[PDB]
Amino acid sequence: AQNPNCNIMIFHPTKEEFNDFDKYIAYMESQGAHRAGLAKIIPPKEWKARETYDNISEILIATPLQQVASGRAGVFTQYHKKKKAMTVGEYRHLANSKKYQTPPHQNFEDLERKYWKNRIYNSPIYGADISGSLFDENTKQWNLGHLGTIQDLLEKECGVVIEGVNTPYLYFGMWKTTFAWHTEDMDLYSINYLHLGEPKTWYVVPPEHGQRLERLARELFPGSSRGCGAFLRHKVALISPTVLKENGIPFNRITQEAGEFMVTFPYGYHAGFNHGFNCAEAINFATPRWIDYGKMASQCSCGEARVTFSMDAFVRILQPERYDLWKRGQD
Ligand SMILES: O=C(O)CNC(=O)C(=O)O
Numbered sequence: 001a002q003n004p005n006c007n008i009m010i011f012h013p014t015k016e017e018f019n020d021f022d023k024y025i026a027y028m029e030s031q032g033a034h035r036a037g038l039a040k041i042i043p044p045k046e047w048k049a050r051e052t053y054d055n056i057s058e059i060l061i062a063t064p065l066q067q068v069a070s071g072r073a074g075v076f077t078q079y080h081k082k083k084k085a086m087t088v089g090e091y092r093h094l095a096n097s098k099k100y101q102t103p104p105h106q107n108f109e110d111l112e113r114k115y116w117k118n119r120i121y122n123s124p125i126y127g128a129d130i131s132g133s134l135f136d137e138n139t140k141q142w143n144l145g146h147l148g149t150i151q152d153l154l155e156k157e158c159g160v161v162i163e164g165v166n167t168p169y170l171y172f173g174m175w176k177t178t179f180a181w182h183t184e185d186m187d188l189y190s191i192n193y194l195h196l197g198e199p200k201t202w203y204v205v206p207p208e209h210g211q212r213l214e215r216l217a218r219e220l221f222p223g224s225s226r227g228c229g230a231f232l233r234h235k236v237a238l239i240s241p242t243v244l245k246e247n248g249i250p251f252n253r254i255t256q257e258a259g260e261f262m263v264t265f266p267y268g269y270h271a272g273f274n275h276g277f278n279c280a281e282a283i284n285f286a287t288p289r290w291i292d293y294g295k296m297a298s299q300c301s302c303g304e305a306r307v308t309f310s311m312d313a314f315v316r317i318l319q320p321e322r323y324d325l326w327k328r329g330q331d
């Protein structure tokens with residue numbers, strides 16, 4: 001069995017290997033990359049996402065989110081307080097202000113220590129989930145707006161044509177902006193490209209061990225767990241690496257830098273934080289191997305998770321027994 005310890009693997013495809021996206025995902029899986037839940041892909045030196053980032057300041061962040069924490073430093077939830085609209089240029093200035101800027105630090109490990117010690121005492125503002133793309137239309141390789149759609153994959157595997165669309169999303173981050181522990185909708189893959197700026201640190205639980213994380217979360221967030229049998233779908237709970245190690249939960253960590261892709265694999269729980277002002281692009285995708293994960297994915301039906309239009313068909317076709325309850329939670 002490849003990668004039996006479920007380590008995060010790092011790949012360096014050549015320009016020739018960068019042509020066929022699906023083939024390369026399958027290659028990484030042949031080497032056991034999915035066992036980690038997360039892989040890094042460093043593009044060939046010949047590749048670029050676009051020519052420059054000099055002209056992005058007028059992008060609008062319609063609903064910046066202030067991420068307010070509750071709990072203790074290693075075990076907390078965050079809620080998202082909506083803020084007034086601002087441009088990317090305005091947000092960048094805000095990220096660089098004394099109130100929000102990255103502190104002095106020695107290295108990524110010192111900054112990680114500072115994040116976990118201090119995150120709860122601040123409320124950073126995240127420009128998340130903005131429909132759009134920064135790939136040039138002429139970038140033909142690993143262009144996250146030109147991937148095969150999940151609707152087409154389901155149709156190719158299962159024969160059923162479905163409604164829905166699959167487009168990318170932009171994330172503008174600052175120091176301490178945080179992504180809570182989650183798997184993707186319908187336990188899909190995700191791919192994330194860090195276009196510019198400061199790094200993003202990731203934590204990940206191997207898919208084979210995801211239920212260990214779920215059981216810890218139920219213990220640590222006992223009110224939330226009574227509320228909803230899949231409350232990690234709410235994407236609000238954080239657990240630090242120190243707490244995970246104290247509780248024996250298998251996980252790994254890695255820092256993504258500008259110019260690098262990360263891929264999350266079906267049912268790979270992940271969480272993390274941004275180091276400073278940055279911009280990422282991410283989208284969900286599927287492969288044939290996903291279908292069995294999609295059929296078994298948990299679902300939130302309490303009302304909280306509320307998701308895209310295109311999840312309807314995935315539930316309806318892959319999980320018909322759960323569909324009526326789930327759709328009630330959507331309404
Ligand atoms: O970058 C972020 O805030 C969150 N991204 C992801 O969870 C992802 O790409 O799957």
Ligand SMILES: [Mg+2]
Nearest residue numbers: 056057058059
């Ligand atoms: Mg602009």
Ligand code: NI
Nearest residue numbers: 183184190264
């Ligand atoms: Ni994700």
Ligand SMILES: [Zn+2]
Nearest residue numbers: 228300302304
């Ligand atoms: Zn719920």
